[PDB]
Design a protein around this ligand. Structure first.
Ligand code: AZR
Ligand code: ZN
Ligand code: ZN
Ligand code: ZN
Ligand code: ZN
Ligand code: ZN
Ligand code: ZN
Ligand code: ZN
Length: 347
């Protein structure tokens, strides 16, 4: 593979510097998938990573949850300007009478936090959490990246479709996308392909309320590259195609980043500096005011304990990259390596 030297030059230094036990890398160019696999999925078994190895992709899950939401819209079960409580009777009477589904999807409802408080560990406590929640900002005015925000959006999207979220994903959406080894619940027969994550102390670890919706997907580099392909070349089902397209529309911007449903987008070519800034601690951790929206590059980061994932692609150039590791290594390292590889593929 004549792309191997290019990918190795950017990936190998990451593996050494951060002692990454294993990484699956997949690249798309000119309609062809290329797989580059490094190290081990499981340090006990010493089993090699392949493009069929399942990794936790953490917040990259939000691109798939967004696509379910968009599918619900395409099917007429909901609209992004619906008030949230329209799809949750238990939210009637709360501030969610005046927050929209799109605002939940784009983390712009008014300062829902990054994580549920640790005490919110059941269905009953979660419902009380949202019912008592007091907005910090007016709806639409600030982005605060939030699991409770998009988690709720996904949860209500499934409810709009009258099916549990895990079932819709595993039985309809993901196989519709060509993703047959992508799970919220990894089945018995897939367990032997399931990587372990490795904490900073080299302890093996595996994955909360609305975990499924916000960060719970297990998938392979092959499946994730198929999702990238679907975001470039498209898919057979008309409803799913339109769903995917809705996830590309920009809602608002924060600096040079434009927020859509799940995917975050940039004018391409994109400087390393612009891509680093939109994926910076400032953008991830603080509230930022929303501004008017923007070739286009789409990306999403994901970081669970013991896992670090990144996906980026450019439909106008037919290029894309997936990087899945079982170490949570820094986002800037992911962004830099991806940017370098895509620049070489773009020619
Ligand atoms: C998405 O991956 C999201 N990550 C999380 O919600 C989790 N942890 O976040 C950090 C490490 C900040 C924390 O400890 O609070 C998480 C999910 S399952 C699990 N065990 N941890 C992050 C914030 N998104 S990303 O874009 O920064 O990667
Ligand atoms: Zn490190
Ligand atoms: Zn209840
Ligand atoms: Zn529910
Ligand atoms: Zn520690
Ligand atoms: Zn057809
Ligand atoms: Zn919007
Ligand atoms: Zn402000």
């Amino acid at each position: 593979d004549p792309l191997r030297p290019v990918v190795d030059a950017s990936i190998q230094p990451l593996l050494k510097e951060h002692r990454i036990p294993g990484m699956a890398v997949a690249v798309l160019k000119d309609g062809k998938a290329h797989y580059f696999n490094y190290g081990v999925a499981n340090r006990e078994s010493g089993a090699s990573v392949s493009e069929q190895t399942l990794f936790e992709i953490g917040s990259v899950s939000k691109t798939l949850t967004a696509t379910l939401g968009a599918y619900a819209v395409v099917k007429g079960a909901m609209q992004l300007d619906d008030k949230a409580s329209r799809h949750a009777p238990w939210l009637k009477g709360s501030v969610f009478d005046s927050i929209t589904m799109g605002e939940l999807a784009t983390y712009s409802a008014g300062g829902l936090p990054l994580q549920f408080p640790e005490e919110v560990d059941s269905s009953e406590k979660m419902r009380a959490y949202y019912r008592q929640w007091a907005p910090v900002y007016s709806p639409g005015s600030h982005r605060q990246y939030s699991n409770p925000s998009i988690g709720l959006f996904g949860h209500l999207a499934a409810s709009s479709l009258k099916q549990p979220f895990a079932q819709l994903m595993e039985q309809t959406l993901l196989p519709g996308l060509g993703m047959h080894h992508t799970y919220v619940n990894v089945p018995k027969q897939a367990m032997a392909s399931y990587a372990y994550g490795y904490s900073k102390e080299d302890k093996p670890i595996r994955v909360g309320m609305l975990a499924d919706e916000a960060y719970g997907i297990k998938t392979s580099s092959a499946d994730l590259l198929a999702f990238v392909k679907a975001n470039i070349g498209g898919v057979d089902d008309k409803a799913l195609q339109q769903a995917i397209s809705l996830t590309h529309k920009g809602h608002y911007s924060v600096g040079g980043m434009t927020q859509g449903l799940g995917w975050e987008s940039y004018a391409y070519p994109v400087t390393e500096q612009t891509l680093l800034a939109g994926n910076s601690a400032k953008v991830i951790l603080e509230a930022n005011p929303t501004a008017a929206p923007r070739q286009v590059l789409f990306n999403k980061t994901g970081s669970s304990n013991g896992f670090g994932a990144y996906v980026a692609f450019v439909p106008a150039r037919g290029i894309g990259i997936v990087m899945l590791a079982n170490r949570n290594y820094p986002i800037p390292a992911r962004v830099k390596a991806a940017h370098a590889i895509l620049a070489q593929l773009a020619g």
